[PDB]
C-alpha cells in the first residue's frame, strides 16, 4: 500500500516483489504497484492529495528500501545513483496519471457525462463539446513525436528536413517527456479516454505508457497544445529552453498550429536563477513579429501537492480548450 | 618565455612572478610566456605546436615557478588550475585573431600583406570599409551596449514591449564578437598593427579594446561570434538568440556563432550543432547553421589560416 504493511510485503511473490535480488535492483513497476496499486495521488484520500508532493513521489523508494531491509538485512545495498534515477522515473509516472485522471475527467464532463465530485474540484466553466476531449501522452524516451503526426503532415517535416540536408542543414531536435493532445475524432466516443484509473497497476502502467501508440499518425499539427519535461532536480537549464523553441518553430510555424506551450516540472529548484531564464519569449514568436507572443517554457512548475497539480492541470484545459472550436 | 628559464624568473619582481601568496596570476603567467610569443605569428615550431600544449605552456610554467619557490608547501587545485587554462585558452586565441585582424587590417588599407609567418594572401578586394576589430568582451557583458544608440532604442523598447505582457527579452553573452571597424576608425593604426606579445600593455589593450567602440557598431556590421569552452544547448540557444536580435529585429544580413574547444567530450556535439538557425527557418528567405562549426584547433597556425578563410569569405559581403 501507500503506507508500508508488514503483512502485504509477505504476501508479495518472488515476481511482485520492490526489491529484484540479481548487488540488487529497483523494480520499479512492482514499486508503484506496491506504493501506488490503488492510490492516484490528487485522486485519493484527502491526506494524500494534500500531502507534500516530494514525500509522495519518495514513497515507492522508501517503501522499497524497507523490503529489502526486511529480506536482506545488511546484504541489501543500493547506491545513491539508483535511487536517483528511479525516483526521477517515478515523479514523470506518478504525475503523468495524475494528469491522465484530470483528462479522464475532463473528457467525461466534454462528452456531457457530468462533472465527478470524488474528491472535490472546481466545475470547469468551458462549455462541454466532444471536440474538446484530451489525450496525456507519456511518451518513450527518445521518441520522435513527428510520428504523432497524420501522414501529410509527416511529410511536410520529411521534405523540409531533407531540403535542409541538401544545404549541410540539420533538422533542430527536440523530445519532450510527455504531450497533451486534443483527442482524434476518431476516438471521440471511445469510453476508454473517460475512465479514471483507481491506482498505478501494472495493466493501468501498460495501459498509460502505451497510449501515444494508439494515436500515432492520427494527430493534426494544430491539435498538439502541451508539451512537458520532467527534472526531478533542475541543475541541465537550457535544453529544455532550446528545444521548447523547437518545437513551436516547427509546429506553429511549418505546420500552422495555433499555440504550442511547454512546461518544465521539478521538485528541487538549483536557486531561482532557472525562473528568470524560463521567462524568456518564445524565439519563432518574435522572428514572426505578428501574432501575440508567448513564452517558450510557460512555467517552471514546482508541484507543491498532488492536488495542487491537479488544479493547474484542469485550469490549463479549461483556458486553453477554449481555443478548440 | 615560453621556454621556462631560471635566469628570467629570478630576474622578476615579486609582483611579477607568476605564483601569489597559491594563487596563478595569469596576468604575470601570460607576460612571462607569452611576452614575446604571439602562437600562429612566431617561431614554425611554435606555430605548428599542438595548441593543447601551446595553452598548457603558462601553467606548467607558473606550476615550475612555484615548485622552485615553494618547494615544501606548493600546492594548487586541478579546479584551479583548470580554471585558469580556460581563460588563457580564450585570452590566447583571442591574441591570434587580433594578430589576424591586424594584418588583415594593414593588406585592406593597400599596406600589403606581411609574409612572416606565411598565411595564404586573400583573394578579396581590398578596401578600407572592409577593416574587422577583434573584441574580447567581458564576463557577463551585454553586446547591446556596442550598437548605435539608435539600435539601443530598439531593443530597449522590444524588451519593454515583451515585459509588459509578462515576456523576458532572451539572453546572449558571447566571449568574443568580430566587427566591421566603424567608419571614424578606419586610419587608426592601432587597428593594423600586430603586437609583439601578451606584455602587460598589450594584454589591457586587446582585453579593453570593446570600450572603444560601444555605441559605435552598426546592427549589420557585427559578423562572428565566439565562445570558448553535457553543457551543449546553452551555446547553441545563444546564438539562435543573436541570430533573431540582429538579424531579425536589426536586419542584419549575417551573424555567424561560433565554439572553440580543446577536446569535445564526445561525438554528439558536432551532430548536435549541425542545427540550422532557428530564426532563419522563421523568415525562410539562405539559412545557416545557428552554431557554424564547433572547431577544435589543432595549432595555432591552423587557427589563423581559419580566420583568415572566414574573413576572405565573409567581408566579400561588405
Ligand atoms: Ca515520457
Ligand atoms: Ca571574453
Excluded at 476508454?192 to 492520427?218: C, D, F, H, K, V
Excluded at 495555433?258 to 521538485?267: A, I
Excluded at 524565439?283 to 497539480?309: C, F, K, M, N, Q
Aim: proline share 6%; net charge negative; aromatic share 10%.
Amino acid at each position: 500500500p501507500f503506507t508500508y504493511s508488514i503483512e502485504a510485503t509477505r504476501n508479495l511473490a518472488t515476481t511482485e516483489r520492490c526489491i529484484q535480488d540479481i548487488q540488487f535492483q529497483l523494480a520499479q513497476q512492482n514499486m508503484l504497484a506496491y506504493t501506488f496499486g490503488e492510490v492516484i495521488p490528487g485522486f485519493a484520500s484527502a491526506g494524500i492529495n494534500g500531502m507534500d508532493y516530494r514525500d509522495v513521489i519518495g514513497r515507492p523508494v522508501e517503501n522499497a528500501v524497507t523490503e529489502g531491509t526486511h529480506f536482506f538485512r545488511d546484504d541489501f545495498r543500493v547506491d545513491s545513483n539508483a535511487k536517483a534515477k528511479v525516483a526521477g522515473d517515478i515523479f514523470e509516472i506518478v504525475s503523468s496519471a495524475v494528469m491522465w485522471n484530470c483528462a479522464a475527467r475532463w473528457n467525461s464532463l466534454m462528452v456531457g457525462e457530468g462533472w465527478r465530485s470524488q474528491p472535490r474540484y472546481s466545475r470547469p466553466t468551458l462549455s462541454p463539446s466532444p471536440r474538446r476531449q484530451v489525450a496525456v501522452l507519456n511518451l518513450p524516451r527518445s521518441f520522435d513525436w513527428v510520428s504523432l503526426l497524420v501522414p501529410e503532415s509527416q511529410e511536410v517535416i520529411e521534405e523540409f528536413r531533407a531540403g535542409l540536408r541538401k544545404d549541410g542543414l540539420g533538422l533542430p531536435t527536440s523530445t519532450p517527456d510527455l504531450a497533451v493532445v486534443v483527442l482524434p475524432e476518431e476516438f471521440q466516443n471511445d469510453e476508454m479516454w473517460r475512465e479514471e484509473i483507481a491506482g498505478l497497476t501494472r495493466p493501468n502502467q501498460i495501459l498509460l505508457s502505451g497510449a501515444y501508440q494508439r494515436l500515432q499518425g492520427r494527430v493534426q499539427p494544430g491539435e498538439i497544445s502541451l508539451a512537458v519535461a520532467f527534472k526531478r532536480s533542475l541543475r541541465r537549464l537550457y535544453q529544455p529552453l532550446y528545444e521548447a523553441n523547437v518545437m513551436q518553430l516547427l509546429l506553429e510555424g511549418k505546420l500552422g498550429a495555433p499555440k504550442v506551450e511547454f512546461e518544465v516540472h521539478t521538485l528541487a529548484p538549483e536557486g531561482t536563477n532557472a525562473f528568470v531564464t524560463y521567462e524568456a519569449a518564445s524565439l519563432y514568436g518574435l522572428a514572426e513579429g505578428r501574432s501575440a507572443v508567448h513564452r517558450a517554457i510557460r512555467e517552471l512548475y514546482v508541484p507543491p501537492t498532488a492536488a495542487d497539480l491537479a488544479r493547474r492541470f484542469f485550469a490549463f484545459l479549461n483556458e486553453r480548450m477554449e481555443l478548440v472550436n
